[PDB]
Amino acid sequence: GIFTKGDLINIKLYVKHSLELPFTLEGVKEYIGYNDIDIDGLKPAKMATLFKEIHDHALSWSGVESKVQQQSIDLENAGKQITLTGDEIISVIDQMPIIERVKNKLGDLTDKQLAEITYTNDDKEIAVELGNILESMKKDIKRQQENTQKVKTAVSDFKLKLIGGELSDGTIAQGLQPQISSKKKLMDDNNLSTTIKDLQSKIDEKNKEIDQFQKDYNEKARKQKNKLIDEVKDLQSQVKDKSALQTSVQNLSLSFAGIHTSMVDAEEALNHLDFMWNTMLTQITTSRDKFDDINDALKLTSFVIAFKQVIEPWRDVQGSAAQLIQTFDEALAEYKK
């Protein structure tokens, strides 16, 4: 399928790296490297809120993955059931002569079993009569459409919380990735280095004055020399503080670049997985809508044509479900290795 093992690997790597991040105020303050900053966007409270949101998203991924795997198994089983039963029914109806195929209608077969053909629904209930089989299959297809829709909603909500958009409940959610980008831009466009350079230039001029005074005198100049010494001491303490803060901000920018890279890699994978589940949901909806065209008054030839149209998408559905199962097994084994 279009969703590869590398895609799931990228998603799981993003989840792991996001779980390695701290989510408490003290842990956030230790990670960012400061307890306070003059920049309101980089305040520790906002950073802690963003980290906590990322942490909750990473926690939600496990439930999303489980839902995807469980519904893929269910779709493979339901597709095998529907395909095999429908093929048996179609072959049995095709074996009878053309004259009965044209004169008889579907209703002439609904009240009796079609040559020991049986169908078991999602509630483990068995149906033997053809009409009961068709109604049970219709209900199963509707329920599988609902379940596939729920899984697609889960995957879409995960991806939208990552990149941004309107969630399933109508809530407008700003993506965690653009928020990471905004914070990184705040880290990269500030005047910390400017203040550092200005203070350092003042200190260098005063140090040149101190050097010249020391070289030249050894009374009024002595007091000026000591005044310059005290001024240099104060400005140097300020420079040390601001230099530590600026180094922390620069390193945090690097860390946020890494977070952004991981989020970007996960985004493509989520796009692929969402597309695959949407394709399967569309095929199931096509099957349900075609089943809506079945009635007892139809001739056996028309019924065979319509029922072929009904059960055709389930072949692709079960193929895609088996592909998802295989890719998940391979990717999880490779991640455990």
Residue numbers in the entry: 41 to 258, 287 to 405
What do the authors of the reporting publication say about this deposited model?
α-Xenorhabdolysin is a PFT that has been first isolated from the bacterium Xenorhabdus nematophila. Xenorhabdolysins are also found in other entomopathogenic bacteria, such as Photorhabdus luminescens, and human pathogenic bacteria, such as Yersinia enterocolitica and Proteus mirabilis. They are composed of two subunits, namely XaxA (45 kDa) and XaxB (40 kDa) and are only active when the two components act together. In contrast to previous predictions, XaxAB is therefore not a typical binary toxin, but rather a bi-component α-PFT.
Phases were determined using the anomalous sulfur signal of the merged datasets and HKL2MAP, the graphical interface for SHELX C/D/E. The obtained phases combined with the given sequence and a few placed α-helices in the density with COOT were sufficient enough for phenix autobuild to almost completely build the structure of XaxA. In XaxA, the tip of the coiled-coil, predicted as hydrophobic transmembrane region is not resolved in our crystal structure, however, secondary structure predictions for this region suggest a continuation of the coiled-coil. Interestingly, in the case of XaxB the tongue is formed by an amphipathic helix, while XaxA does not contain such motif. Comparing the structure of XaxA with that of its pore conformation (see below) suggests that XaxA is already in its extended conformation as soluble monomer. The neck and head domains of XaxA are also arranged similarly to the crystal structure, however, the coiled-coil is twisted by 15 Å and interacts with helices αB and αC of the adjacent XaxB. Interestingly, the protein was not incorporated into the liposomes and no larger structures could be observed on the vesicles. This indicates that albeit the hydrophobic tip of the head domain, XaxA cannot spontaneously insert blank membranes in vitro. Importantly, YaxA does not contain the hook-shaped loop (lp1), which is a prominent feature of XaxA.
